Each structure stands twice: as C-alpha cells, then as structure tokens.
Amino acid sequence: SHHWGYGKHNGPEHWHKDFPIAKGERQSPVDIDTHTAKYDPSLKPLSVSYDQATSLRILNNGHAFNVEFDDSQDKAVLKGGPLDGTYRLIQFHFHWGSLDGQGSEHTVDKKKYAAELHLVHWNTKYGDFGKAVQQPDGLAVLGIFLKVGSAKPGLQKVVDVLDSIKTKGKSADFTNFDPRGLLPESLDYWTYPGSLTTPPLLECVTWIVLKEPISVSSEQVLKFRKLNFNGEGEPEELMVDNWRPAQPLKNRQIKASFK
Numbered sequence: 650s651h652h653w654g655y656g657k658h659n660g661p662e663h664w665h666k667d668f669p670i671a672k673g674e675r676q677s678p679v680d681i682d683t684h685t686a687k688y689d690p691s692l693k694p695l696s697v698s699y700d701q702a703t704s705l706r707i708l709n710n711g712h713a714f715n716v717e718f719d720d721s722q723d724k725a726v727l728k729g730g731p732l733d734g735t736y737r738l739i740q741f742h743f744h745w746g747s748l749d750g751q752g753s754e755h756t757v758d759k760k761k762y763a764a765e766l767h768l769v770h771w772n773t774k775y776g777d778f779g780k781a782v783q784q785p786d787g788l789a790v791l792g793i794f795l796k797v798g799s800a801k802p803g804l805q806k807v808v809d810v811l812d813s814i815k816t817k818g819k820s821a822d823f824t825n826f827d828p829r830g831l832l833p834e835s836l837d838y839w840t841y842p843g844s845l846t847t848p849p850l851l852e853c854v855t856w857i858v859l860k861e862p863i864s865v866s867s868e869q870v871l872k873f874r875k876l877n878f879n880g881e882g883e884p885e886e887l888m889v890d891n892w893r894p895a896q897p898l899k900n901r902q903i904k905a906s907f908k
C-alpha cells in the first residue's frame with residue numbers, strides 16, 4: 650500500500666523507491682527564474698470560467714485537504730493560455746509550511762511563499778480524470794501563491810470547516826463555495842510542462858502559476874496548521890510542511906504571459 654508522506658522517513662527524498670518517475674525528465678515543482686523565463690506572444694488569453702462551479706465536499710486525505718467539485722459536466726473550466734481545448738475543475742487543495750517562510754512548492758527566484766493553492770483540472774478530450782493521467786497533456790494545474798498579510802475573505806469558509814475534518818479520512822459537506830474568491834486580480838502567469846507534485850508523480854501536467862500572490866491572514870494559515878496527518882485516535886502529527894521542494898528543470902523552458 651501507499652506509505653509515502655512528508656516525514657524524514659517517508660518524505661520526498663524517499664519517493665523515488667516506489668515511484669521511480671520521481672527522477673524523471675519533467676518533474677514538479679520547479680524554481681521559476683524570472684529573468685530566464687521568456688515572454689511568449691503565442692500564448693492566447695487565459696480563461697478561468699468558474700461561474701457555474703459546483704463544490705460538493707471537503708476531504709482530509711492525510712496529505713492535504715481537497716475541496717471537491719461536480720465534474721460530471723463542464724461547470725467550471727480552464728481554457729486558453731498554453732492550453733489546447735477545455736480542462737474541467739475537479740478539486741483544489743493547498744500546500745503549506747510550519748512557519749510563514751516556507752510552504753510553497755514552486756519558488757520564484759528561490760523565494761518560498763507561505764503556501765500554494767492548486768486548482769486541478771483534467772482535459773475533457775480524455776473523458777475522465779483516470780484516463781487523463783495517462784496522457785502528457787491530461788491535466789492543467791492553476792497554482793496561486795499565498796503570502797501572509799491581510800485576510801482573504803473568500804478563504805474563510807474553508808478555514809471555518811477545517812475543525813470538522815481534523816484527521817485523515819474525515820470529510821464534510823462543502824456545497825455552494827465559490828472558488829473565484831481565491832484568485833488574485835491579475836491572471837499574469839508562468840507556464841511549463843511538469844508533473845503531479847505528490848506520488849504517483851505522473852508527468853501529465855501543464856502548470857500555470859500566477860505571478861500575483863493572494864494575501865491571507867496569519868490566523869487563516871494558523872488554522873491550516875492545526876489539521877492532522879494522522880487518523881482519529883492516533884498520536885497527533887500536525888499537517889504542516891506538506892510541500893515537495895523544487896526539482897531539476899532539465900530540458901524545459903518556462904514561458905511568461907506578460908512582458
């Protein structure tokens with residue numbers, strides 16, 4: 650069974666023994682060297698179309714928490730930018746640190762943010778998520794950095810349900826949540842071909858990482874850090890530092906949408 654995690658004994662430096670693609674040619678995350686990324690005029694406008702998004706449930710999976718969406722129809726989709734065709738939102742989750750100075754997966758000129766939001770989408774040409782993760786263009790993940798400052802009003806409903814999903818395997822109803830409240834003003838981005846950042850580390854992802862971070866309050870991120878990796882009744886292991894560090898860029902170029 651899967652027994653990877655983020656500890657010293659099961660963390661990122663161990664994953665390659667059960668998931669050898671961990672040492673592959675298009676792994677994520679990466680450091681975004683802002684001076685080496687090149688503006689790409691070929692990029693078409695990015696279209697985030699979440700008006701009809703239908704959230705259903707929030708789940709503590711022992712690695713992070715997922716806010717899950719009804720992806721049985723094109724209710725919430727990502728198009729444009731580097732993407733060919735339509736990518737449907739299935740879930741979002743975060744990665745965060747034990748302290749405000751770390752937590753993001755991607756870095757920007759080696760800077761680590763306090764957290765990183767991942768909105769996960771699958772290419773509808775492949776019919777469902779499981780088939781999409783067999784394809785090099787199966788997924789698109791919209792990544793958004795979080796810095797600590799003023800509160801993000803649209804995050805507070807997520808924060809407030811976390812007490813009900815403290816431990817691994819717990820879920821709660823989470824209907825009528827609008828993911829548009831988690832976006833920054835600007836859709837300026839960097840993009841590159843990469844992978845899932847957790848096992849199974851599959852190389853299916855077009856990454857779209859927004860330049861502008863959102864601000865969340867210290868009190869909001871402190872509540873993330875009260876979650877548990879462990880199950881109910883087990884010794885407490887706070888869910889913190891659930892991020893993979895930057896991986897080798899190898900034969901890739903990062904493109905910028907902005908000049």
Ligand SMILES: NS(=O)(=O)c1ccc(CCC(=O)O)cc1
Nearest residue numbers: 652653658659663664665666667
């Ligand atoms: N390569 S990996 O998936 O990161 C991994 C690392 C450590 C163990 C040992 C876990 C145990 O005691 O069950 C199992 C699997």
Ligand SMILES: NS(=O)(=O)c1ccc(CCC(=O)O)cc1
Nearest residue numbers: 767769790844845846847848849
């Ligand atoms: N952090 S990330 O790259 O946005 C990501 C997205 C989805 C999975 C789910 C993988 C699975 O279904 O096993 C794993 C990791």
Ligand SMILES: [Zn+2]
Nearest residue numbers: 742744767846
């Ligand atoms: Zn993620």
